């Protein structure tokens, strides 16, 4: 049933933030987001995001 060891979760992060992310987390992949649409005032129109696949901690 439930996902287990070695699986990952999706985390949406500012591209600027990736280099500062906790280095003890294992990143499986990182993808640059394109054509982002802000649907909240809290997100600015030109914010550049990425998606990181972060491995579940052991």
């Amino acid at each position: 049933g439930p996902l287990g060891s070695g699986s990952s979760i999706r985390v949406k992060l500012l591209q600027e933030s990736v280099v500062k992310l906790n280095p003890k987390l294992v990143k499986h992949n990182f993808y640059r987001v394109e054509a982002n649409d802000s649907e909240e005032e809290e997100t600015e129109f030109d914010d550049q995001f990425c998606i990181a696949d972060i491995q579940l901690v052991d």
Partner: protein, 475 residues
Amino acid sequence: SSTSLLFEQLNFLILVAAEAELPIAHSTRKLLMDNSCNNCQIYELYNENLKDVKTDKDWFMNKFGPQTVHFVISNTINFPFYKIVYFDLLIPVVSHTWVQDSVKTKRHLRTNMYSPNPFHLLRDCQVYISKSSFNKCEYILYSDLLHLLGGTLVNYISNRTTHVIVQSPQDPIIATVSKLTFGEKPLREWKFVYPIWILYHFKMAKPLKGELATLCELDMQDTSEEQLFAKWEEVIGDKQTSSSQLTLHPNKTLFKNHHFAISPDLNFFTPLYWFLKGFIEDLDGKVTPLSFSDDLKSVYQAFPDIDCYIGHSANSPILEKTKSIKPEIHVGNVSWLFYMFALQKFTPVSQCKLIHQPFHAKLFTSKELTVAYTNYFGSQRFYIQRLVEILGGLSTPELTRKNTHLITKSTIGKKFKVAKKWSLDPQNAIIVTNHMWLEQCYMNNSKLNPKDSRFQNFKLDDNMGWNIGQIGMDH
């Protein structure tokens, strides 16, 4: 007044509930027109005698089509075609302030927070359900109820995630999300809750408060099954009767004269089965759980009133044997129960949607089917998430180079422009196709060619009958 292309190619219907509301309807129509809406209809509820005419889907499509309606603007849900607009056609119903705020902020704001439905208690929530806590049937049930409560389901963690649903402190997602730090500033302050946070709102139809709110919060000391059982019993147990859930859903005999056999391929956490059984019985339905060891002929002979089967998988041998014993039995899934609850009418599965039958075997893998989508609003986004999930793929609200497909119904917006260019780049080669490709692949259980001309039609909004979720419904 200022102008823009904000509402380009979108159709609106404004429902006026009282004569005094006409100036608000006029100002909203001006806002829509000045920002390039395709069409704006105003309909005065108070000026037709609707209580003697069936305002069903055919009535609505004939009166307000043939093109689709992208949004209904209404400060109330108290109009007789709300259920077919919202639960069937999947058209958002939003207050006038959604238009005002969307123009002010120059963007299409999320519709959930602007729903006038008082049962949409979770409208301000963006909820991540942990797949390392729950099996597939639990995940689907919690997703269904979150959606019925007006919340947004997300499959990614961000600084906008308001709630993370977990089963127990043993879920490794808790420590993983808690370690999302930068340096050490956290991505945000996290709220981990047990699924009874969802269930209480659904069962009681009122906000969680006081000690019951605190009991729904993740407690790292809850390391035993017994402790989890005890919290479930206090929050949604038989001493918490549905105080006003039936005020908002007044058909208390929805399931009268129906008796549901529950397949063993639904392996719920046991107090979640108790919740589901109580939900059915509170609506005057009857429940019999089936076991893999039952002699089905004996069970159906002893309970000849059983007329419905509820199961997770279309390919269960229990279901095959059941159909040979009871050829006329209703065959549905748990989502079907909640759809009938939303419609407030018992409805044969053939008149419901593709997602209301026990699920096909996975047609695709995630490597084959990881789809972005664009130009869908409100409950359409939930539907495409579910459709992709039961096809065997993954869905994403964002577009990246990981995506294999972009699903769209029109040519507007940034993602369509980017993905069309990517489709011509041999280094990328993403496929752009419409939602009828997804729907027909599932309905025919076959990997159809997404470049067929019928799936390259990006003017589907020209016909309301092509709304996503309509394929597969019998009249």
